Amino acid sequence: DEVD
Amino acid sequence: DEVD
């Protein structure tokens, strides 16, 4: 999971 | 007619 990563943020944009 | 008027704006808020």
Next chain:
Amino acid sequence: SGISLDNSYKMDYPEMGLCIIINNKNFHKSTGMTSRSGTDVDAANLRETFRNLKYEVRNKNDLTREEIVELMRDVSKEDHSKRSSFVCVLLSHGEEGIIFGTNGPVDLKKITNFFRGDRCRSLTGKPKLFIIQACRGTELDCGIETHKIPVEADFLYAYSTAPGYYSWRNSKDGSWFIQSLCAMLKQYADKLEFMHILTRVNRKVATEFESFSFDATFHAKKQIPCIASMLTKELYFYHL
């Protein structure tokens, strides 16, 4: 029992819930804000409309920014366990993200934060509706001829106007948006899901209203409301 669906909010609690109506008409002289002629028409229309939907309506007039924050904090600390939903209607001057008390502005975020899923536990998982008749800027629409849940989940913001735009209010008939909202709730609340009602509100405001002004800058202008939905289920004001 047989197969069960859970696509719609449970709206058969003992109470529909509170409807808080904040009606700011007269502003402190030092703010320089004008009186909002016609807003009492809106407030009366909303009171009757939501009374017929069986909401416990509380009308509040001419609140300071401090009174707005205190009222919303107090309401969020009530026990809403027996209530299906929560509704708050704000009638005031405003800007993008801001509503005005009689003596100065309030961040919309400050008001709605009191009702976050983690800060008002008796409304967690229940629809929280914020209906906002206020400017979101100064743009004018010249028209064209034709196990955990998010703390921000289960909010619906029924904005009277698009982001960045003025919002129109008639001094005799009330605001375009609130006029249209009450008429569509009266006609369709026993028949349509709430997003579909608000879409009819969008169409009514977009097609039936156009400003008339002696000032060419403000003449022949149009308006589209903006539905901002963080809801996770369908919302019907009736139940089976």
Next chain:
Amino acid sequence: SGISLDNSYKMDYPEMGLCIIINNKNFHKSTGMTSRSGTDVDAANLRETFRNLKYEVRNKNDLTREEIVELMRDVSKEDHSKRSSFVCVLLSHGEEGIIFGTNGPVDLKKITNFFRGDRCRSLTGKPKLFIIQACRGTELDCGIETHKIPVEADFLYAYSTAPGYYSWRNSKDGSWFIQSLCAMLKQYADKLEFMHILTRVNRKVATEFESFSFDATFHAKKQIPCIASMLTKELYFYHL
């Protein structure tokens, strides 16, 4: 003929319309933006999903801010007369109101202004859908345990996340929002109105996803998408 209703957009034009997918994965080193691992999964899922809805899909990869503006201006100057609708999907880094080209930012307003009712006449009165998988800020949701029309009318913004918040993307499975959107379109596009589909998307994202991170700041976080509707009719992807 008999009684006629006009509550839903006409979706039986010869063509459903264009679906423009802008998939920005690799960013110019000088911007300091990271690569968006997993976004090709999103772009492929969207292409297949909208192909099955009979949209003319055009996939574009790694566009500069100049290329994005040129592409959207060019698309808005096409003749959409035979097309029921218009769809644009933006997959990129972003901030509130901003999407990033590979070399710098683009105002969302600049993109959508090309399609205003007065600036793209062959889409006037037709639904214009902007689906945006991008951050809207840096907030994290820690969750809780359980004759004229307006020029801004007929737009729908399907935001992946609430205003002010990060948006989550899994490097293996794709973004939470696009994953859920395609699954709900696949399952319900022949059955439900589009606002109801997007509400199922909200619920899927809100209930089925939670971040896992070795970094306590980014661990166990949640997300709610935000539907911003300026539509004036119901939208069904099928017709009778």
